[PDB]
A paper describes a structure:
We determined the structures for the inactive constructs PgDPP1122-720 S655A, PeDPP1122-717 S652A and its complexes with the dipeptides Arg-Asp and Arg-Glu, as well as the substrate Leu-Asp-Val-Trp, at 2.4, 2.85, 2.2, 2.1 and 2.6 Å resolution, referred to as PgDPP11, PeDPP11, PeDPP11:RD, PeDPP11:RE and PeDPP11:LDVWs, respectively. In PeDPP11:LDVW, the third and fourth amino acids of the substrate (Val and Trp at positions P1′ and P2′, respectively) exhibit few interactions with the enzyme. For instance, Val (P1′) displays a weakly defined electron density with only 40% of its solvent accessible area buried by DPP11, while Trp (P2′) completely lacks electron density. This active site design renders the enzyme’s specificity more relaxed, with selectivity imposed mainly at P1 and P2 residues of the substrate. However, our crystal structures of DPP11 in complex with LDVW and dipeptide RD are both in closed conformation, excluding the possibility that solvent released from the protein’s cleft would explain the larger increase in entropy upon substrate binding. When compared to unbound PeDPP11, the r.m.s.d. of the helical domain is 5-fold higher than that of the catalytic domain for PeDPP11:LDVW and 2-fold higher for PeDPP11:RD and PeDPP11:RE. Particularly, the unfolding of helix α14 (residues 320–346) and loop F441-K451 upon LDVW binding corroborates our hypothesis that protein conformational change is the determining factor for the opposed thermodynamics signatures observed upon peptide binding. Consistent with the measured endothermic binding, we propose that energy is absorbed from the solution to break key interactions, such as those stabilizing loop F441-K451 and intra-main chain polar interactions that stabilize helix α14, but possibly in additional regions of the helical domain. Upon DPP11-substrate binding, the increase in protein conformational entropy counterbalances the overall entropic costs in protein-peptide interactions (including loss of protein and peptide degrees of freedom).
Numbering used by the authors: 22 to 315, 319 to 441, 451 to 717
Write the structure that this text describes.
Amino acid sequence: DGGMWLMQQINGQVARMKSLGMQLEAADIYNPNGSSLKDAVVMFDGGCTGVLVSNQGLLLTNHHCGYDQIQKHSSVQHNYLKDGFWSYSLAEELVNPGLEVEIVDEITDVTAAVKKELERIKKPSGLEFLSPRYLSSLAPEIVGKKAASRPGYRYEIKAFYGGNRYYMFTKKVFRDVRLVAAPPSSIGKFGSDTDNWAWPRHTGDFSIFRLYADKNGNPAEYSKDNVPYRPKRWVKVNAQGVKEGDFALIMGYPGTTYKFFTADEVTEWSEIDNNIRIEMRGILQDVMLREMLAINIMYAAKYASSQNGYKRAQGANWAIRRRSLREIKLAQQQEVLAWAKQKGIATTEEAVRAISKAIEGRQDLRMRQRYLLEGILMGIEMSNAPAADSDIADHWDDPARREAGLQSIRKQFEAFFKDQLAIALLTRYAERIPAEKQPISIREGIAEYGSAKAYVEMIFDKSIYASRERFEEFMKNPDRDRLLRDPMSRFAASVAYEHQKLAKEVAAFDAPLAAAQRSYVASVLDMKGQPNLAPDANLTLRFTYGEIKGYQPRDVVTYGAKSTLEGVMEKEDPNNWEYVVDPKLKALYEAKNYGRYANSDGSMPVNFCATTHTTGGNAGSPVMNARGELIGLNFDRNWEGVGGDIEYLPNYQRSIILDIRYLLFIIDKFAGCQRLIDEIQPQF
């Protein structure tokens, strides 16, 4: 199994899908000529998925997708992160500036078109035929006035199959997306650390938004007279529950896969990107833990993000050792190599040779890129330190410029908001990177101060952005020269410099590599048929299907397909931030007050898992039953499924899904927001 299918690949798959129990027509799911399910599956925050579930544009996504919004409306008397949030009228729904949600108007093959505007490039770079920025900046010339016209629409074009296809997505872009509801963190990220990437799972990973339109029902900035968008198609919520072996369909926006990796590629990604992440985030997850001195670990967002990718890395390294992945890809790469030879072709073979060549050439440079990335760019927040704009430098003596320049600073600082973390990371960074290959500021700082430690310490001492209260003191009496010579802004600047410098040099290998990549995939595409080959993920809309089914992780151990509230009670621990259970939830358990939302055996459902092929970016994806109705929301994969980006394994890999009845239960029985039960209209 496997495959994240193009929406227009549905005809080639509808067959097998009905086989496993689907009772939908291909055109129910994707319809070029009009209304279909594709119209209900939206992209959230350019990172997650979401689904429209009412005619008033109600939008279901994951708690961890909407975590930042909630944190942004949260405060000491708000604190929606802790208590959750429940709006009872359209007016109560919160506004969140800078949050976008893209629907897909339609999908157009633009392969021929793109390839021509690709030729006739004066001395091309070698990288543009993949770059979405460049590829989307071709859209007007393809569709004319209507592009760069409708303010609501946006035109996205990406490379598929290594660059052997290009498809275009006409995106309606909504810019007033409002926060309806959220559960408390105790439910939304229950087991946040331990249970992450794990099945069994007991997490209510949901949150609710709504799309707002204008009087005529179009994408819109925020306006006090915006109104609930009336969707073409929204998905119906079915609450008659699920049983093992049921058909399950997922539609959403998978971000990245490497299913066409050659053997040498697997090994590099493992030994370079993956391991450097393991090394570096391990240090971070150390120093940031052992500051164990009481506050709640639950709301440490930076830590949580890092740890989430740390664990995925760990589980990827694992699957490469234990699932024998390099050897699996090697077997694939040599099928096509065989097929080529037998058809007397040499294009295939010289690609693999090239791919391996590019790899060994860029070893030092990619390694450098990655230590910089993991160790400093992501790890150390000094890298996002404010920089003085032109006003401050040039026009300090024009009170208007100066105040705007200063207000550029306060703006930057706010987005920038600790000592020993930077030390630990820079210390190890400096050990791995020869001083001459370090960023100017760093190797010079270590020169003066004789240690990465002392250099770091200097910064936190001499800098204005070291703490909020230090900063505000400075702004009481701002000084020009002080702003221009801050050691942390220097750091941030030198680190970014090396970042772009590395990327320039390494282009010498990446470009041969992408070319060779394209050749190789062509061969595969030649061997198999495009209708039967699902491309890598690229944050565009895909579907995947399977069944609700558990697995056997071990000898003697069997995991089932479905999870219940008793699992929550079993894990309870008042002394573990992670497993604190909400009293109102507990009371409900010991009252067994599950209304019509309970399983057949009278247990209260929480999650379930299925054989669908999802990945990062799929968070929030709708999960639908055989008839197209919504039975759940995707939010994770299991530990054994992490190596599915490289190769899908049908008997370990599972998508971890929130039971839609758990969501309902929480709104209804826990929160009391009947209004939203009423808008959603669960079907029984």
